Structure formats: C-alpha cells, structure tokens
C-alpha cells in the first residue's frame, strides 16, 4: 500500500511525504529539492545511513510506516 515518510534536515525541519512501497524515490527526492530550491546534486538522501538512489523503493530498502529519511549536504575539503 502506502507509507508515511518524514524527511528531516540538520536544522530539524521535517517534510512529510506519503509514498507507495513499490515506487522510485527519485521523485520524493526531486520534490524535496524543489521545496528547498536547490539542485539535485546539492543534497544526499540517506535512510538509516544508507544512500537513497533514484531507483530505490521503500520496499527494497525495507522502510516502514512512519520512517525517517535524513538529508545531508555536500562535503568538500582541501
């Protein structure tokens, strides 16, 4: 069926999404970036430490009702 997801940021701001288990999260990620107004390649979406790819589905990742997706920013260093 459907699953309720909570995408949280470092600022602890949380965006809620209602997604279906067998669906690519490439959209949820794309929607999030828009609500933030930043390029895709600007953030990283991790589910329990694991990097969420475009063709990733909550079923595959084994996400459950009311789960969290943490968002991280690009790291650079010299």
């Amino acid at each position: 069926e459907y699953i309720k997801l909570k995408v949280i940021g470092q600022d602890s701001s949380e965006i809620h999404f209602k997604v279906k288990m067998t669906t690519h999260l490439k959209k949820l990620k794309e929607s999030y970036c828009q609500r933030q107004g930043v390029p895709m390649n600007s953030l990283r979406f991790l589910f329990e430490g694991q990097r969420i790819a475009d063709n990733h589905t909550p079923k595959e990742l084994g996400m459950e009702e009311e789960d969290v997706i943490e968002v991280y920013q690009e790291q650079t260093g010299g």
Binding site: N41, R44, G49, R51, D54, Q75, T76
Partner: protein, 205 residues
C-alpha cells in the same frame, strides 16, 4: 553539471563531482565515498583484507549526535566480521582517515597535514564498544587495542591546500592492500588523473 557519468554500488557520480578531481580542486564526498566503495569491492579478492567503509557522514554524526544516532547505519553488516573498517573523516575544509584493523588490533588516525586527533580514535573505540553490545550482545574486549595517530614524519604529507582528499583515498588504497604507503605529493597530479579514470571505469587500476 548534473549529467551522470559513471555509476555503481547504488551510487551515481556526475560531471560536477568528477570535476572536483581536477587540478587543485577540493574533492567532495561523492568522490571519496565512491572511491572508498571500490576499495571495499576489491577487498573481496583472496589475499586481501576484507574491508567495510562507512560513508563520510558517519563519523561527524557519531561525534555530534552520539552512538544512539548511527547505531542503525550498521543494520545490514557485521562490523566485526571484516578485517578493516574504513572511516573517512570530514573536518569542514579538510579530509582525514581513521582505520580500524581488527587484525593488528589497533585504531590509527591518518592526517596528511600532521594533525593528531587521538580523540577521534577514542570515539571509535567507544563505538566498537557500543556495537559489540547493540549487535553481538557481548562486551567488546579492548585488551591489546592501540589508539594512536601517525606522525607527519611517518606518512607522506601534502604540500598544498587541496590534495587532502587524495591522500585520504590513497592512504586507504595502500592500507587496504597491506602494502607500505609508498607515494608522495609528487604523484598527486597523476593519482588525480588515474582516479577520474578508475571511477568512470569503476575499476581500480
């Protein structure tokens, strides 16, 4: 740009990233983690130590939010069933590497700029302590564990303000092969080239 160029380990490296490997550019988390992934891939071969690498977000998270915040990152892997744990470290504008070797039984910090961070190693030993409990339900045996940091005169130092990520990566490359770190700053430019290659090819020369 945004155009994906190479991809594997369920990751995707784009042109914007590959460009960070360019002349004197600071590498980003995408390159480090991708490269680290190739090392863990290769670690499957016989004659090499099995390796598990955490992504460049783990240590910071573990340091600022505590164990309770990353305990689920190792839900699908038994940390203690590998020989080497690779811990890339991001220090805001500089890259470092922490390495747990259950064989040599010690946790060593690597800085191409001569920093020391033995604290980082204490954080990691504590971590090993919480994992052994959370996952294997026993108490970790620290007996014999050495927490130390390589001195500037022990490992190749960088001579600019950009190759930190490169050293981090190459350090792990050599370490993962049980071979003495035998390169120098002089090789960096080449190494950078060899990596934009290795990465677009997904194979470590």
């Amino acid at each position: 740009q945004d155009e994906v160029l190479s991809e594997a380990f369920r990751l995707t490296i784009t042109r914007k990233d590959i460009q960070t490997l360019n002349h004197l550019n600071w590498l980003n988390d995408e390159i480090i983690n991708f490269y680290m992934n190739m090392l863990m891939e290769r670690s499957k071969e016989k004659g090499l130590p099995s390796v598990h690498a955490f992504n460049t977000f783990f240590f910071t998270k573990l340091k600022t939010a505590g164990y309770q915040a990353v305990k689920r990152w190792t839900k699908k892997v038994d940390v203690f069933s590998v020989d080497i744990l690779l811990v890339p470290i991001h220090l805001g504008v500089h890259w470092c590497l922490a390495v747990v070797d259950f064989r040599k039984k010690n946790i060593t910090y690597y800085d191409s700029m001569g920093g020391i961070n033995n604290e980082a190693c204490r954080i990691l030993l504590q971590y090993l302590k919480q994992e052994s409990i959370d996952k294997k339900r026993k108490e970790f045996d620290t007996n014999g564990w050495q927490l130390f940091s390589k001195k500037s005169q022990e490992i190749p130092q960088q001579m600019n303000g950009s190759d930190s990520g490169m050293f981090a990566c190459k350090y792990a490359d050599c370490i993962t092969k049980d071979r003495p770190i035998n390169f120098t700053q002089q090789h960096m430019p080449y190494f950078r080239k060899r990596m934009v290659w290795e990465i677009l090819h997904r194979k470590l020369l």
